[PDB]
Ligand binder design. Structure first.
Ligand SMILES: N[C@@H](CCCC[B-](O)(O)O)C(=O)O
Ligand SMILES: N[C@@H](CCCC[B-](O)(O)O)C(=O)O
Ligand SMILES: N[C@@H](CCCC[B-](O)(O)O)C(=O)O
Ligand SMILES: [Mn+2]
Ligand SMILES: [Mn+2]
Ligand SMILES: [Mn+2]
Ligand SMILES: [Mn+2]
Ligand SMILES: [Mn+2]
Ligand SMILES: [Mn+2]
Ligand code: NA
Ligand code: NA
Ligand code: NA
Lengths: 313, 313, 313
């Protein structure tokens, strides 16, 4: 069963237009298409994110109270969906929302493991960031090993880090800040940058990823999918594109393999910004790619699908 | 030695323009280019497909008598080419013609094995099809295991199924109807959908394909190549394109490997529809890609080719 | 440490515009970007290539004296840079300059091994060439095994072949003349054509390449990188593009792996011709791709880079 949550929120980064991700994904028939695969799909609507007009930067960190609150609300809504026995599907919205999505999920399933598909590690702290954009920091707020390195940023007093360095795998990396690379190598976080993907192939990547996270014991998976993880030729309508990304095929491979574990528990589909398509067709290409990736998470398979009936009768 | 047969036929599907495939492939210098690799290339011309004006649908199956007859004629012509000791090269034309091409081939070489390169399984029956388009059904007419599930469709009383479920390998699949997936899993047909290609790489795919078909004993290969098996970025001028296809490189890899078996016996180059190019360059890109794939089947190798002489003398 | 040498030279082939490669690569901030990775980057300027007005063809070989001289000068400059303890970085310019670059390098490091990344083998002799273009012949001038097959071509009396057939590996091949293929198979030269890359994946390719060249003993590597080795979709602004090339990812993989050997000693970045971009964006795409490949050679890594400091302090 699936619980859809819309998160029309942009203040984790500078470009307007990402708050429209939930609308365009919905207008592409996401809900109807999902119903062709699972009988029980519940749309919990778009979260009403109140304007927080007074929100001056904390040091260089931008819109901290807005970002913190949006994630707090989202965590509550994800925890509710999880309690209702459903897979949470978060339509973003910028990637700072993963703070809420993962935190909420972890309230119900503290043993979850995270697969983070992104060109970026999104693990800057409030102190290592040079942009101040909170969509480049969510992982730092979630990791137990970093608690004493996160300042008390207004808006985030509610956060309790819910994952260890061992509980996350990165796939797709190709634009990692030096401080983030320091944190990555210091904490021993498991990652498959595009170098690894090139070396091993996406087949070996997914085998290793899933062995790593699930080998010891079965536990819930959280897939946090930044559409910028895919090459700009597939998902151009996004805020921080980086060339040499994952292919459309590789994207579906990742999501097909995750689906087949039967352990998908939470999903974020993040950073679709239709306002940044150069043409109407760049928008449609991005949105269609996002929809495809999503459907694969809930069982659409390139080899085909059939219902348990005799089709020759 | 090579025997070229043109099959300018479209009534297996709705879009006009596929009947022009043989002309554009020929105008690209297919014949001359093939002569740079084999001395003996014989053009048996384009088959004269008579209009069959009275051809109402059989249930929802469209143009059944036209399709059946075109394939009957083609089977005769392929059998003739095979008897003349030549590799048959069928220029399509829509993929329903594979009924004729494979049937004819099998009259001379009943032990043939088929490699089917396509985004689609083309294995709907007259009873499972929802489109009624016969280019989505040819494999169902050919398979022995399905004989009792094919109704007596007008135009096809001449057909005798000539292959078993073990005698075919699919490569490229990514848009398989539920009924087709049922048939695929019921009959135990060997396939490499795009998921498999992604998992294993095209190298392992071709090793497995050829081990599967040829391991027990050497026998003739029939390659039925739907240009929609390649991604629309390579072969856009085709009727049923599906994103996330095989690459140009993968296409040449498949055909290079088949060539090197020395067992290529029949070839179909199908579903080029120049009328569907958005631009002149989409047409040329499609036609050039089709020509490349074809030349690779008869020995053009990316590492290079030389004649048995001393070039430093 | 790095020594940059500009080689604004085009007479190894017919198209003007390649002499501008060094300028556009420099205007893209190549030098500044390299300084973000190594403290000591020295620009030795552009070589002043004097016009040689009287330069009639030798048989069909074009501009032989111009090409020979440009390479002689370049060899001198590379040998100087090498003596100064620096990695030579040659900005081309057409690929005939590899005669000079490799020869110069070998004067200081006779044990070097060459990795040649190209759609072409560039190993025609003055006698096997059909174009007469000297950028299709440089390897033939360098190989010891061919000495008695190279005529005394005006401009090249200074050359002494400095590498054996065992000392070179080709990656990317896909348009090899028959005579070149004869030489390739006769001399037993190690190569990974696009067929091999497709078969094995770029991961296995680089493992095999580097095992082959370095397994016995560590020695200096010379990377001669023709941008036409990458697919025209990545590096369109070049004189002899060939479809089905290496990807942008594969290009960075090759160069990342070479970097990590710590044995990179000489680098050529060749055949960027901005005059051949169909649009300003084709030029920028080509130049940016060339710059990326170069930065990867000197340590820019897709997983990230950090300096030896504590970033959480
Ligand atoms: N590391 C940069 C880029 C972050 C981009 C965030 B993302 O992955 O969600 O698009 C920053 O800290 O601003
Ligand atoms: N399965 C669909 C699509 C078939 C397309 C056929 B083909 O592979 O030859 O393009 C149908 O039965 O119509
Ligand atoms: N083999 C052809 C093409 C050579 C192209 C050279 B190159 O790799 O440097 O672009 C010739 O001899 O002219
Ligand atoms: Mn992100
Ligand atoms: Mn990102
Ligand atoms: Mn087909
Ligand atoms: Mn098809
Ligand atoms: Mn070259
Ligand atoms: Mn070349
Ligand atoms: Na992003
Ligand atoms: Na087709
Ligand atoms: Na070139």
């Amino acid at each position: 069963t699936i619980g859809i949550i819309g998160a029309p929120f942009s203040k984790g980064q500078p470009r307007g237009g990402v708050e429209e991700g939930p609308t365009v994904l919905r207008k592409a028939g996401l809900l109807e298409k999902l119903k062709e695969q699972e009988c029980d799909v519940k749309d919990y609507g778009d979260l009403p994110f109140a304007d927080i007009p007074n929100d001056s930067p904390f040091q260089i960190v931008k819109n901290p109270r807005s970002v913190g609150k949006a994630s707090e609300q989202l965590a509550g809504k994800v925890a509710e969906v999880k309690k209702n026995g459903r897979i949470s599907l978060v339509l973003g919205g910028d990637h700072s929302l993963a703070i809420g999505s993962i935190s909420g999920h972890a309230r119900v399933h503290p043993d979850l493991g995270v697969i983070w598909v992104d060109a970026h590690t999104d693990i800057n702290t409030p102190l290592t960031t040079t942009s101040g954009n909170l969509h480049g920091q969510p992982v730092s707020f979630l990791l137990k090993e970093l608690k004493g390195k996160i300042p008390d940023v207004p808006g985030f007093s509610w956060v309790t880090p819910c994952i260890s360095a061992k509980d996350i795998v990165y796939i797709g990396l190709r634009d990692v800040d030096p401080g983030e690379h320091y944190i990555l190598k210091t904490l021993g976080i498991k990652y498959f940058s595009m170098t690894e993907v090139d070396r091993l192939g996406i087949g070996k990547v997914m085998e290793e990823t899933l062995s790593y996270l699930l080998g010891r014991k079965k536990r819930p998976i959280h897939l946090s999918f930044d559409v910028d993880g895919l090459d700009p030729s597939f998902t151009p309508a996004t805020g921080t594109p980086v060339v040499g990304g994952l292919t459309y095929r590789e994207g579906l491979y990742i999501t097909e393999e995750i689906y087949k574990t039967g352990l998908l528990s939470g999903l974020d589909i993040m950073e679709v910004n239709p306002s940044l398509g150069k043409t109407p067709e760049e928008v449609t290409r991005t949105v269609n790619t996002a929809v495809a990736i999503t459907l694969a998470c809930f069982g659409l398979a390139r080899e085909g699908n059939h219902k348990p009936i005799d089709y020759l009768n």
